[PDB]
Write a protein that binds this ligand. Structure first.
Ligand code: PLM
Ligand code: PLM
Lengths: 57, 255, 267, 237, 104, 67, 60, 57, 60, 267, 57, 125, 104
């Protein structure tokens, strides 16, 4: 029961991985987790502010 | 029914016509074009004059004597003070362009000589001193000939450049300089040589004032000879034409 | 695989494959069957060992330095540059621009130095190799807080096992490494001229984690480069003149080739 | 605990091995390739290009541009020798420094044909004919135009097309030859004589030059990567 | 990298001798800066952001022209002083040096 | 992967992307194409090395002692 | 006995490697995650925020 | 997920390979890439030159 | 990190073992075989041939 | 697998399997069942261990040399040749032409030499083995720039692990190695006569990367050849006379066999 | 891509093998190649000689 | 598109190339071939080297002065001592062959002269 | 490989003795060349492309016949000189030697 995933390559390959322990805190790190959501820190307001319209009318 | 020895080139408001020629060398098989949208890095929009720069500029002539080693020119540095090409590169920060080199040398049937015309990308040149490096205004010449010199330049505390013709100032065999696009002018047959060079660099655009993409070299492998009576003054003339030139980063003038 | 020779016969015609013009670059694409009679010969020779990958992908020593376990020189440093040696540099300077991943190998060996101390029963030596990126803090001494290697990549090695090997991704702000640069870093055109302007590969530090004995010991490290996944552009002629410096192409003018006795001499 | 067993050849370093190794910079984003002109994929594309050959490498000519030139002239005879040199592309002083010769110095075996192009560099009024000949090993260098004719030859007539190509073919007992000077795998000899005489009119120069370019055919190959004997490093620069 | 490491300066007597040692710090080089002037044995020393005034004959004659910016030149005076001056600038990762020959 | 720059042209209108209020936290979400003319540029740069995992997951000495 | 062979780079420590290792506390039950506000997934969300710039950093 | 390729043999065999890292700069070198195109360096002209015909007519 | 265990008989040299080893000359092109007459595939083809026997091996 | 014996009976006929002519080469293909009565006997014996592969494919020492870590002899060299020893050479000289891949193994051992220095606490020794192809640069000394091994294949070994083994492809310009050559290298037929003319296998260099102590140490290297993937042609008789030199077949005439007492003696 | 072959056993079992290199001169030796043809050395005549018939008639 | 003034001839391991020439004359309209089976008389089998003889042999040159009458050569007698052609004819009793005669004389535009090249069968003198 | 390593030359007195040591350099052998003539203690030495003229009796009598090409023979004169001469040619990869016995 092996997992095949993609390698990190440039732009403009697959690799194999098997878990040998039964602890789930023994596996390798999770390096390929590319998810962002800056709408919390930036734009943290209640009423949505459109870009083109004035801020305070 | 025409003769392949006759060629005409029209760029901008300029034309050149040859009665005797060999062919046209087209660089590395690439015809110069503009920068695509998947290869660019700068965000702001480029300017493209398209006619006021991409024409033929004619540099000063040089006398070919019976004992001339050779001459070299930096293509970006040579057109720095000529026409609108110089003005556009002055104001802008980033410039990308391609060129063509038509070298003209005409002699009679009795005259016999051989000239090698080659374009060298990143033609870094060495200094006479082993410790220091060649000074500017010693390696570079504005619309100037910048000839070579048979025999080594003396070693001392001076930023002089080594001008040996046989090493060519780069420390490599003069004969093996045929690896870059080259054309031969044989007085008995060829009168002129045409070379088209696409933009070649490790980056999409570069600062024209501090970096030179290519170096044109004219080296007489076989000397000039004639008999008493024939004309002695035999000049060589060079015309360069920027192709598909574009500029970015407009700012105050200077360098 | 190479092309196979075909078979021709006697010919009397107006065709002129041999006669041509070298004024044009056009390297004549003639084959022996055009100037003589040939037999058909299948050619199973393969153009495999000549590829740029097989040419460049072999380890090659680029720098070896020393350090001690006592005294003044207690650690070693070296800015990453392949121009320290001549064999690797000449091969790479066949091309203008190269782009390749790098495999790094180290060979660390110690030697007991002459002294007069007694009862020297040494322990196993452990060595730490640390890399500093262009801008990272550099260790002032051998017990500096820099060696904490929180983010800098480092490697620890215990004397006696297989050498340590790591693989490095193409590191550059450009699109290809530049072997030759014609220009300056400053616009005023008055400063450093040459490739030195472009180079920025960081610094490498090696040292003894422990002393291991009361007597002096001198360790030496040799660094080995292997280019992988190579791409190369715009070939240029091989270096005739011997190298002088590591920063520039400064040379001494030399003979184009060696001399014989006559023009008809066979030796 | 899977039971394994270590074979001889463990924990060794090989200058030429092909293994995987853990990257020291994980999840690194390389720059997107751009199209730079003129990509090299094989070294036998650098060798198929012409390179001027220093045939006149005699005395102090090597320190001058005179080495490349072959002097031809008008003489009161015929059948005189112009030049001659052996066929040793990697070892002969004549070819050691050319592009193909320098490439060969990184290899032990070479096998293929060899193109030799000659360009006439005299007046447009001067005319003549030359005999370019190649002799296989077994009997020494030919000493006369008549002995040279018995070997592979091409009669070159100077006209509108200044260049000419003598294509030295592969005649060998073995499949490959040695780049280093060897006696078992000998090359041959390449000579040039006057088929007729140089004809020059009045008020024209009677002393002309020829130039020689060397390249490889489409069947050239090399083997056994080695170290060039040309470079020498006294100390770390 | 100090520009023009090999240099010769000819200056007449009774005229202050100007010696220039301009350098360009490498991006790799990020360490404490030390500038030392040798007379072939020291005339002046710059270390830990401090200037120290070493040579009895040139005492009260040798002073810097500008150091942090990248210029480490000196202006000597009262020439009589024929010798070779070696300007050695030190950064923790990399080092460079320039030798100037002064006649009269 | 990072966003690609688009192309705009000359504009004369009542829209005011630049003018805003920093009294509100609202970090202006303007791009260069709003205050100048830009060309279309595909961006293959990837926001991969900046993730918290790649930032923190590297060994680091925390204490060394003797006996 | 499967025949193997050790390559260079064995028994070394890399400050930046990605391997598995035997857990020292087997069958450990971690606390169930709760939703804490404001999770960071990338460092380029901390950088897209405004920060007052000390332009007049002159003298004292 | 293993890749099976051909071994380098003489003229006149398969081997197996698996990628154990997730970096794409850790794999082995690419030795079997036999592709040539000398039409750039040799014959770099604009008007095609046939072999049998004269060069300059 | 796959857990393994070394059995007795490791790191030894056997005059008669059959293992694979990394080639020192990668991607080498061998010469194409030609047909030479009289190939030996077994030593019991050299033995099935007649050979004169020295029966009178007495004295000188 | 070998043929099985069949069963015959009493026979009175004109057939003559036994009577034949040895004037012709025709080795009589008679079996025991032709000159006596035999029983049927299945034969499960297999002709497996006699194949050329099982005969030749076994490691065999061909040369052992020494070097030191101080003094004059600091490195060792040896042109590759299998004729240095007698056991490997005799087995290979059963055939005229052989074609085989080679597996190379080395055994390096050091020994502390007698001296009078004190406080000798040595470190682990690392040894480097380098190959030079026919034409490659050769190291003048032990600290020559040749050891950079940019292109020459080399190997590094740290004392204490399994020996180093590498595999070599059939290296030859011919189509088979030649054990015997009847001829000369020069056409004039006046020079080196024999196989020496054909041989061109390069040179092998071995040395200490580090000293490792203040006292003298002498290392010795033994080289082991193993032919793999063997092909062999045209068999020839085994060597009777003892070997004298490594370059030629020079021998001293010797007795055809050993002597007994009589022609009817059973011992 | 593994090859399964037969082991050498007595008369009156299978084994597995995989190639880990890309060189074809790295594999193990070929020990199980049992092919003979002594008709070259023995019986090297032009006219076939039957056993029962006389040699020279 | 080429010029009829340029010609190349390849025989054996030899070649000749001309920049200026007139044409090729082909004898009496006959191209040389081998002997048929209905025209032969000798019974024993012929030898045909085909490459070691049928190539170009270059005879000694002759100076053309302002007062030279002319020159003549016997084609069978001329190649008697040259290459393998001479050796084959020496050992054998009967020989049958055809030839070609390429005569080369190059001068400048200023030089003026005329030469007649003719082959005479049975040119008894 | 020096041809005829074991050789005996009988030369009459009053006649220059000719000793020949022709050799064939191996392709494997690519090193600095040294040629040494021993008299059984040296008469002549060729090293680093230089010839040195060692033996008081044979001083001004021993000279080379040709060395780089492959011929390293000597021509002795004024024989009185009975002894064994060993010609030793050295290449960095391989070495060879020839011994010639001269009577009267
Ligand atoms: C302990 C970790 C060590 C990591 C060190 C990484 C250093 C990488 C250096 C790369 C240098 C590449 C230079 C190429 C220059 C060129 O091709 O012109
Ligand atoms: C460190 C790398 C070492 C590599 C050395 C390779 C040397 C190969 C030598 C092969 C010799 C084969 C000789 C066979 C001669 C014969 O069969 O007659």
């Amino acid at each position: 029961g092996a997992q095949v995933s993609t390698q990190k390559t440039g732009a403009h390959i697959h690799y194999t991985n098997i878990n040998y322990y039964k602890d789930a805190a023994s596996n390798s790190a999770n390096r390929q987790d590319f998810t962002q959501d800056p709408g919390k820190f930036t734009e943290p307001v209640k009423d949505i502010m459109i870009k083109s319209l004035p801020a305070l009318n | 029914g025409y003769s392949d020895r006759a060629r005409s080139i029209t760029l901008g408001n300029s034309t050149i016509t040859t009665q005797e020629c060999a062919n046209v060398v087209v660089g590395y098989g690439v015809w110069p074009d503009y920068l695509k949208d998947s290869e660019a890095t700068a965000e702001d929009q480029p300017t493209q004059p398209d006619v006021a720069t991409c024409r033929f500029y004619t540099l000063d002539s040089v006398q070919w004597q019976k004992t001339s080693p050779g001459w070299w020119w930096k293509l970006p540095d040579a057109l720095s003070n000529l026409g609108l090409f110089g003005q556009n590169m002055q104001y802008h920060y980033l410039g990308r362009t391609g060129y063509t080199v038509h070298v003209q040398c005409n002699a009679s049937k009795f005259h016999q000589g051989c000239l090698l015309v080659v374009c060298v990308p990143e033609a870094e040149m060495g200094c006479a001193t082993l410790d220091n490096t060649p000074s500017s205004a010693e390696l570079l010449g504005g619309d100037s000939a910048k000839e070579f010199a048979d025999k080594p330049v003396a070693s001392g505390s001076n930023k002089l450049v080594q001008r040996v013709v046989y090493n060519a100032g780069m420390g490599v065999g003069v004969g093996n300089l045929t690896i870059f696009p080259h054309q031969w002018i044989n007085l008995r047959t060829n009168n002129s040589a045409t070379i088209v060079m696409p933009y070649t660099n490790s980056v999409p655009m570069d600062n024209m004032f501090r970096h030179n993409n290519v170096t044109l070299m004219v080296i007489p492998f076989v000397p000039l000879d004639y008999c008493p009576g024939s004309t002695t003054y035999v000049p060589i003339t060079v015309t360069i034409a920027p192709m598909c030139a574009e500029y970015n980063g407009l700012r105050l003038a200077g360098h | 695989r190479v092309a196979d020779t075909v078979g021709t016969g006697p010919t009397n015609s107006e065709a002129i494959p041999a006669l041509t013009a070298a004024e044009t670059g056009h390297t004549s694409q003639v084959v022996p069957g055009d100037t003589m009679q040939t037999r058909h010969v299948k050619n199973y020779h393969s153009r495999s060992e000549s590829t740029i990958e097989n040419f460049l992908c072999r380890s090659a020593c680029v720098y070896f330095t020393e350090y001690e376990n006592s005294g003044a020189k207690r650690y070693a440093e070296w800015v990453l540059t392949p121009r320290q040696a001549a064999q690797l540099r000449r091969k790479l300077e066949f091309f203008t621009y190269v782009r390749f991943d790098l495999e790094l190998t180290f060979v660390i060996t110690s030697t007991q130095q002459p002294s007069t101390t007694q009862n020297q029963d040494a322990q196993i030596l452990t060595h730490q190799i640390m890399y500093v990126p262009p801008g990272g803090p550099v260790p002032d001494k051998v017990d500096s807080y820099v060696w904490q290697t929180s983010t800098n990549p480092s490697v620890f090695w215990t004397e006696g096992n297989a050498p340590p090997r790591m693989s490095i991704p193409f590191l550059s702000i450009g699109n290809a490494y530049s072997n030759f640069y014609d220009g300056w870093s400053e616009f005023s055109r008055n400063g450093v001229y040459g490739i030195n302007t472009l180079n920025n590969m960081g610094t490498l530090y090696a040292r003894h984690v422990n002393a291991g004995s009361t007597g002096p010991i001198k360790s030496t490290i040799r660094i080995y480069f292997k280019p992988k996944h190579v791409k190369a552009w715009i070939p240029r002629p091989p270096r005739l003149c011997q190298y002088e410096k590591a920063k520039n192409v400064n040379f001494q003018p030399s003979g184009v080739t060696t001399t014989r006795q006559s023009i008809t001499t066979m030796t | 605990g899977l039971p394994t067993m270590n074979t001889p050849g463990s924990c060794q370093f090989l200058t030429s091995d092909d293994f995987q190794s853990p990257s020291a910079m994980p999840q690194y984003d390389v720059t997107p390739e751009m199209r730079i002109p003129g990509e090299v994929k094989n070294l036998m594309e650098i060798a198929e290009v012409d390179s001027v050959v220093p045939v006149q490498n005699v005395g102090e000519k090597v320190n001058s541009m005179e080495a490349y030139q072959i002097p031809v002239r008008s003489n009161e005879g015929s059948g005189t020798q112009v030049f001659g040199f052996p066929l040793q592309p990697g070892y002969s002083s004549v070819f050691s420094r050319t592009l193909l010769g320098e490439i060969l110095n990184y290899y032990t075996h070479w096998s293929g044909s060899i193109k030799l192009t000659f360009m006439f560099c005299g007046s447009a009024m001067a005319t003549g004919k030359f005999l370019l000949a190649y002799s296989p090993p077994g009997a020494g260098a030919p000493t006369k135009r008549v002995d040279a004719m018995l070997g592979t030859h091409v009669v070159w007539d100077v006209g509108l097309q200044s260049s000419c190509v003598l294509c030295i073919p592969w005649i060998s007992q073995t499949h490959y030859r040695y780049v280093t000077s060897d006696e078992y795998t000998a090359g041959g000899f390449i000579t040039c004589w006057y088929q007729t005489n140089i004809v020059v009119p009045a008020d024209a120069q009677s002393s002309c030059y020829i130039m020689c370019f060397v390249s490889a055919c489409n069947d050239f190959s090399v083997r056994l990567l080695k170290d060039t004997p040309f470079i020498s490093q006294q100390n770390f620069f | 990298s100090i520009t023009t490491p090999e240099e010769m300066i000819e200056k007449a007597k009774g005229e202050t001798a100007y010696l220039p040692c301009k350098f360009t710090l490498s991006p790799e080089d990020q360490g404490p800066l030390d500038i030392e002037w040798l007379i072939s044995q020291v005339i002046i020393l710059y270390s830990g952001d401090k200037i120290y005034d070493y040579y009895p004959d040139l005492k009260g004659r040798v002073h810097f022209t500008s150091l942090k910016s990248g210029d480490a030149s000196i202006n000597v005076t009262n020439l009589q002083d024929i010798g070779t001056y070696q300007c050695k600038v030190k950064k923790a990762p990399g080092v460079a040096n320039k030798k100037i020959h002064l006649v009269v």
